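Q: My labmate handed me this sequence with no annotations at all. I'd like to see what the chain might look like in three dimensions before we decide whether it's worth expressing. Could you predict it?
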Amino acid sequence: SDKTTILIVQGAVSGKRVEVEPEQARKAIKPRWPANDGETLIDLNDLAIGEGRAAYWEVATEKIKAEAKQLLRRPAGQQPPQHLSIFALAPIPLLVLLGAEVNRVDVDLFQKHRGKSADTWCWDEGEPDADDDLKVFVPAELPGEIEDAAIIVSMTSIVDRKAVASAIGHPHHAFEIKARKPGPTFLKYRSQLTSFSNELYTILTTIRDDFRRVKRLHLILACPAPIAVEVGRSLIEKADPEAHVYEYLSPSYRRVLTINP
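A: Here is what I predict for the chain of 261 residues:
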């Protein structure tokens, strides 16, 4: 029941305004309570209007970096926030960036539950069923001199390996974390987020220890917002090479930003 700082992140590249209802996030953090009775907001709607997609990614990347730095700065006469409760609905690559930018502070991540119409941002009570766990596929071939490794998350849908190969444009190893039943309501319990984090850590450790020629990571994520944040949080600047982050722009994947270039 300690104090926490609520961070709301909301936006979209274009189209309908995306907003997080702060009353629902406040309900989700109970029994904890919001520092200053409020939230910090990073809004990523209506950036670079009419200027094209690349201008959006530029403006939004700089805004995420500047706002994360501001969020972690000491206010006058106070300490910096010690715990973030993050409620995010935003483009996947920007949430990877966000997770990397707040990786030095303790965080609680949350999922907007579609289908759970009350306590929408609250994690579900209960236990996961068999359709709710993960499968992890790793390369059949030895690392060798391959310089490129893809980390694929097939949670909201199945990622097509051929589209990944076309987007990466290099011979590569692939590691895949796949929902047993992919879909938009797969992620419901906090234990699933913990499971995902642990499986990703094992993959990153394997690449760091055994795939030492790998000079580029390629993150292809079909996953809910907190999973994208957790992917970003799991990167370690000096242990991992640059991580290229892709968006799904029908019918293909496109590289949109790089963590630790």
